């Protein structure tokens, strides 16, 4: 049920860093060691810049909804739009350029171990320190369901 | 650099599509503004090509469409239901990325770079070449009256570009006929009027016309 | 909608002088979201200042911006010849982004009276059924001038159009044409056609005239 209109586009480069370039077109700041992940909750879409990804472990995009879980198609403009993350591990860019994560696929966000993470289309924007990582095919079973995804590792 | 498409001439009720090609920042936000004759600038709308999200000013909502073509790194502005009020120069410009603010996919910041602008003329009038008449001398002054052409522009030279000092080619004026008119004059030594030859070269590329008129005393 | 009011409409200053342009916002704008642009005839606007006071890439030191809230100012500390143009302010903090109406920075110079010429319609145009009479004001400063048409000593109204050149690169003057348009039939109804020009550089109005068919 995903649509491109369900992408929160609420970016505010108030620190004047130019971080938004890789959303269209070096180091991972405020590094979060994968171990002991924080729990996923409800994220206000007004704080989100660009696509939200979760990792089941396979990568899946999460779109804006209202606070009762109904898909919304306003590019995150409505200040009641949210991402209901609890409904495994997820990551997104917040409006001022900070990469945020919750949960795990211990792991954190897309990271499996401190040296490997799930590949997805916005990996290098969310984690620029992984530009030179190598990619490996992975297969994993979670409760009988088969996952096939690429992993990027150092 | 952003290269915009050439001038457009349209009848009322028609549509026009102008283009804005850049040569490596295509998916970066693009904003369209227009400048009506002798006016300031007015926001039309914009697009973020990476995602396709568009925004429009209320005065153009339902009457314009902005799009982008990723293969040719080109953005487009389509205006429908045209009226004479839509006669303007239409500019394309990139929204700066550093310090950008986006709310619901509406991108605002300073604007740079800019396209060179696209002239759109909307008129009931039909394309027509100018008539060229001498403004005979009586230093002296002489010229050519360039009357009743559509659309703009006309270029005027004297003696195929050999004579440029003292030339004044006035901006065109739109007459109540719907046709344009201008004059170009030059001041010359009085002494020379019986011996020196003065030719005005008028070119109107919309009608493929070229007129050369010798200007001599009555 | 945030209206931006620029003053003055036209600024006349000599090369080398300091220019101060003001832009008044109808509501308070954060200084992060105000920019200044320069435009010359036939050209696209060119960004000068952004964030109220930051100079765009490539913009010379003599351009600076300042202001806060509802009043912003662009300062050119020493006008170079290439600085005489139109300047627009822009707010991009609140949609719709809006632009001021522009200040024209014009070259101040000594008063110069116009040279006045009148041109009768050509026989070629007359055969067409229209007659255009042209009066030319050549190389004058300042720009404001008054042109009155008189036909058979009667003053005219509503049948003339004026056009003014841009300020001249070399001598900083303007030239102006005013064009009286009549039908061939009406043109042949009268004899005396006169152009009367009022200008600061003239001690008294100057008239140029001709008699139809002479
Ligand atoms: C951001 O999103 C919110 C939604 O999360 C949106 O606000 C809500 O919109 C709904 C729908 O218009 C509002 O509910 C209405 O309230 C009025 C006032 O009492 C009722 O009369 C309405 O009933 C009408 O509609 C029924 C079915 O459509 C009809 O059967 C009936 O006969 C009536 O015609 C309806 O219940 C709700 O109140 C707002 N909530 C808020 C807080 O405004 C909001 O508009 C979005 N923001 C923007 C800028 O668009
Ligand atoms: C983008 O970020 C700037 C800076 O944080 C925000 O500016 C603040 O806005 C609030 C409410 O409008 C004011 O109370 C603060 O004083 C402002 N701070 C500064 C430094 O100007 C701006 O509101 C943000 N824009 C959006 C759309 O969220
Ligand atoms: C994006 O995340 C950053 C970091 O978590 C937030 O930055 C904090 O903002 C508060 C409020 O001004 C400050 O007191 C903190 O010092 C900031 N932390 C850091 C590390 O700078 C930022 O607010 C978030 N942006 C949005 C839109 O939610
Ligand atoms: C999605 O966004 C586009 C462009 O901004 C808009 O035309 C459309 O109405 C929006 N909604 C849907 C359901 O496509």
């Amino acid at each position: 049920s995903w649509h491109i209109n369900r992408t929160a586009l609420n970016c505010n480069d108030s620190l004047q860093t130019g971080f938004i370039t890789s959303l269209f077109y070096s180091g991972c700041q405020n590094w979060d060691e994968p171990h002991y992940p924080r729990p996923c909750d409800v994220v206000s879409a007004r704080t989100v810049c660009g696509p939200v990804y979760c990792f089941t472990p396979s990568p899946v995009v999460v779109g804006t909804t209202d606070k009762l879980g109904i898909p919304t198609y306003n590019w995150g403009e409505n200040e009641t739009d949210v991402f209901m993350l609890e409904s495994f591990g997820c990551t997104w860019m917040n409006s001022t350029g900070f990469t945020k994560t919750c949960g795990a696929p211990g792991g954190s966000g897309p990271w499996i171990t401190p040296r490997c993470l799930v590949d997805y289309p916005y990996r290098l924007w969310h984690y620029p320190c992984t530009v030179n990582f190598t990619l490996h095919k992975v297969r994993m079973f979670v409760g009988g369901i088969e996952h096939r995804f690429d992993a990027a590792c150092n | 650099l952003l290269e915009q498409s050439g001038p457009e001439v349209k009848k009322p009720g028609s549509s026009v599509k102008v283009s804005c090609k850049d040569s490596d920042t295509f998916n970066e936000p693009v904003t369209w503004v227009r400048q009506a004759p002798g006016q300031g600038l007015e926001w039309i709308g914009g697009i973020i090509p990476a995602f396709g999200v568009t925004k429009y000013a209320q005065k153009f909502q339902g009457r314009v469409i902005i799009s982008a073509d990723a293969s040719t790194a080109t953005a487009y502005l389509e205006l429908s239901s045209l009226r004479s009020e839509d006669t303007a120069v239409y500019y394309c410009a990139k929204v700066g990325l550093r310090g950008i603010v986006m709310v619901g996919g509406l991108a605002m910041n300073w604007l740079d770079p800019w396209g060179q602008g696209t002239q759109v003329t909307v008129s009931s009038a039909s394309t027509k070449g100018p008539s060229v008449f001498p403004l005979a001398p009586s230093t002296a002054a002489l010229g050519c009256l360039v009357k009743d052409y559509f659309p703009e522009p006309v270029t005027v030279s004297w003696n195929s570009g050999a004579l440029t000092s003292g030339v004044h080619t006035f901006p065109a004026v739109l007459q109540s006929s719907g046709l344009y008119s201008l004059s170009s004059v030059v001041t010359v030594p009085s002494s020379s009027l019986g011996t020196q030859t003065y030719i005005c070269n008028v070119n109107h590329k919309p009608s493929n016309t070229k007129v050369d008129k010798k200007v001599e005393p009555k | 909608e945030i209206e931006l009011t620029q003053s003055p409409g036209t600024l006349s200053l000599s090369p080398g002088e300091r220019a101060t342009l003001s832009c008044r916002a109808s509501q308070s704008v954060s200084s992060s979201y105000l920019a200044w642009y320069q435009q010359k005839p036939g050209q696209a606007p060119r960004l000068l200042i952004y964030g109220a006071s930051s100079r765009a890439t490539g913009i010379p030191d003599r351009f600076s911006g300042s202001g806060s809230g509802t009043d912003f100012t662009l300062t050119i500390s020493r006008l170079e010849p290439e600085d005489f143009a139109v300047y627009y302010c822009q707010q991009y903090g609140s949609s719709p982004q809006t632009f001021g109406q522009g200040t024209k920075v014009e070259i101040k110079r000594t008063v110069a009276a116009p040279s006045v010429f009148i041109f009768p319609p050509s026989d070629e145009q007359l055969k067409s059924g229209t007659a255009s009479v042209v009066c030319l004001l050549n190389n004058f400063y300042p720009r404001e001038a008054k042109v009155q048409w008189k036909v058979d000593n009667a003053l005219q109204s509503g049948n003339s159009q004026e056009s003014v050149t841009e300020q001249d690169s070399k001598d900083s003057t303007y030239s102006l044409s005013s064009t009286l348009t009549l039908s061939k039939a009406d043109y042949e109804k009268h004899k005396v056609y006169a152009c009367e020009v009022t200008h600061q550089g003239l001690s008294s109005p100057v008239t140029k005239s001709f008699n139809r068919g002479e």
Side-chain angles (χ1 to χ4, degrees), chain C residues 93-137:
Chain C
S94 186
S95 192
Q97 58 196 285
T98 47
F99 297 85
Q101 66 290 5
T103 296
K104 178 181 189 187
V105 175
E106 186 229 34
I107 300 166
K108 194 172 61 203
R109 61 148 294 168
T110 57
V111 165
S115 298
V116 184
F117 309 87
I118 187 169
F119 300 100
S122 66
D123 292 352
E124 190 181 349
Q125 183 184 20
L126 284 182
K127 184 192 321 153
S128 84
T130 295
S132 312
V133 192
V134 167
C135 183
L136 168 61
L137 281 61

Side-chain angles (χ1 to χ4, degrees), chain A residues 77-136:
Chain A
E77 179 175 3
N78 195 295
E79 311 166 290
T80 69
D81 285 341
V82 299
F83 297 89
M84 317 210 103
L85 301 203
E86 311 136 329
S87 309
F88 218 61
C90 309
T91 188
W92 65 96
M93 188 73 71
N94 92 345
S95 318
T96 57
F98 295 80
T99 296
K100 304 292 211 183
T101 72
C102 65
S108 162
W111 293 84
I112 308 154
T113 71
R115 89 175 253 270
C116 296
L117 57 99
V118 187
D119 192 27
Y120 64 107
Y122 290 82
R123 158 174 72 90
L124 301 163
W125 187 43
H126 290 158
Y127 301 100
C129 55
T130 72
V131 65
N132 275 32
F133 276 27
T134 67
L135 301 73
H136 323 267

Side-chain angles (χ1 to χ4, degrees), chain C residues 173-191:
Chain C
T173 62
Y174 299 90
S175 297
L176 181 150
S177 63
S178 165
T179 300
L180 184 77
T181 302
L182 311 183
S183 72
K184 171 188 175 49
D186 288 328
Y187 176 72
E188 311 216 280
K189 264 172 211 133
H190 308 266
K191 186 167 77 61

Side-chain angles (χ1 to χ4, degrees), chain B residues 30-174:
Chain B
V30 179
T31 287
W32 290 90
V33 306
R34 81 172 178 198
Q35 185 164 36
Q39 306 293 97
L41 301 143
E42 180 172 42
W43 180 56
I44 298 170
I47 188 173
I48 300 176
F51 297 94
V53 50
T54 56
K55 302 292 172 170
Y56 305 103
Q58 277 191 314
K59 74 172 311 203
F60 301 94
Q61 193 76 48
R63 182 163 57 94
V64 299
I65 294 290
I66 299 172
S67 58
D69 200 318
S71 66
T72 48
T74 297
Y76 301 93
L77 171 64
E78 179 157 22
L79 298 95
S80 54
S81 267
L82 288 166
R83 300 189 186 180
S84 60
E85 302 97 277
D86 300 308
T87 296
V89 171
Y90 290 76
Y91 290 104
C92 160
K94 294 299 181 65
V95 181
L97 294 194
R98 182 182 306 263
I100 197 175
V101 178
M102 290 165 48
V103 175
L106 205 178
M108 290 191 298
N109 205 358
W110 45 261
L111 299 172
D112 177 79
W114 287 69
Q116 82 276 19
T118 291
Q119 169 66 40
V120 171
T121 307
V122 181
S123 198
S124 294
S126 267
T127 299
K128 176 184 174 308
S131 300
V132 180
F133 303 112
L135 298 164
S138 153
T139 68
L142 53 93
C144 277
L145 171 61
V146 184
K147 186 160 184 297
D148 288 338
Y149 65 90
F150 179 87
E152 289 254 81
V154 170
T155 58
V156 182
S157 69
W158 287 89
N159 296 346
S160 315
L163 180 57
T164 55
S165 162
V167 172
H168 293 302
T169 298
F170 292 91
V173 176
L174 178 49

Side-chain angles (χ1 to χ4, degrees), chain C residues 60-109:
Chain C
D61 260 349
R62 60 184 188 272
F63 295 94
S64 71
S66 60
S68 267
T70 62
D71 183 38
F72 299 84
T73 49
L74 175 65
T75 299
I76 311 179
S77 45
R78 231 191 104 83
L79 285 169
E80 296 294 311
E82 60 270 28
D83 297 344
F84 293 86
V86 179
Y87 293 87
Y88 296 104
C89 55
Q90 171 209 24
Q91 70 83 24
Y92 49 93
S94 186
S95 192
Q97 58 196 285
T98 47
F99 297 85
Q101 66 290 5
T103 296
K104 178 181 189 187
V105 175
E106 186 229 34
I107 300 166
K108 194 172 61 203
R109 61 148 294 168

